[PDB]
Amino acid sequence: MEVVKFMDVYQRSYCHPIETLVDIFQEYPDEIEYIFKPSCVPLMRCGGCCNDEGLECVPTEESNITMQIMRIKPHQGQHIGEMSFLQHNKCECRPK
Amino acid sequence: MEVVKFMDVYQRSYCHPIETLVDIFQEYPDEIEYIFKPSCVPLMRCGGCCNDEGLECVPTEESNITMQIMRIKPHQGQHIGEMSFLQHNKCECRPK
């Protein structure tokens, strides 16, 4: 059986940017008159644990990534265009 | 600037197993008298989108992964022990 060693689990779970699949409407809530394809996008976002309830995992560097996304108005045409999304490039455990 | 091309976003977002950080208490709700270090673990879990509201992304192959976790409980001190977690090895879009 493969067992993940403690120090590896700890390092791999600690606060860091991790690819996270995010629904486009979480980021563009006012665009719900459209259907988007794909409907979700992979974004780097802070995730994981700090193992100290006085601390939270928060971004320390942010930027935007642009992706080609198809926009559909039901029963009308499709159009592919650029959409930008917030990413987290660096993460740290900071006091809450 | 980098722009992710449509077909690449579509492929990268589509229903598949993705590393997901999961709180251990969520997987072991019976053990809330424990403190775990780390408090979360990275698990392969189905994620992403199917781009069809008739379909949902669900596991088609499942197994357990075992990890060394520091377990802390009154009268046992802190000790490392094996804990197993459900993982999704294969994912498919299936009718809801």
Residue numbers in the entry:
A (entry chain V), B (entry chain W): 12 to 107
The publication says:
In the present work, we focus on a class of monocyclic disulfide‐containing 19 amino acid peptides targeting the Vascular Endothelial Growth Factor‐A, the main pro‐angiogenic factor in Human. We proposed to use this peptide as a model to rationalize the thermodynamics of α‐helix stabilization by an i to i+4 lactam bridge. Around 950 Å2 of accessible surface area (ASA) was buried at the peptide‐VEGF interface, that overlapped with the VEGF receptor 1 domain 2 (VEGFR1‐d2)‐binding site. Although only lactam‐bridged ExxxK, DxxxK and KxxxD induced the formation of stable helix in the unbound state, all peptides of the series were helically folded when bound to VEGF.
VEGF‐peptide 2 c mixture crystallized also in a tetragonal form that contained no bound peptide. The main backbone displacements occurred in the 83–89 and 35–46 loops, that are flexible in molecular modelling studies as well. Moreover, the conformational exchange involving the flipping of the ϕ dihedral angle of VEGF Asn W62 was already noticed in several crystal structures of apo‐VEGF, which assumes that the two conformations are in dynamical equilibrium in solution.
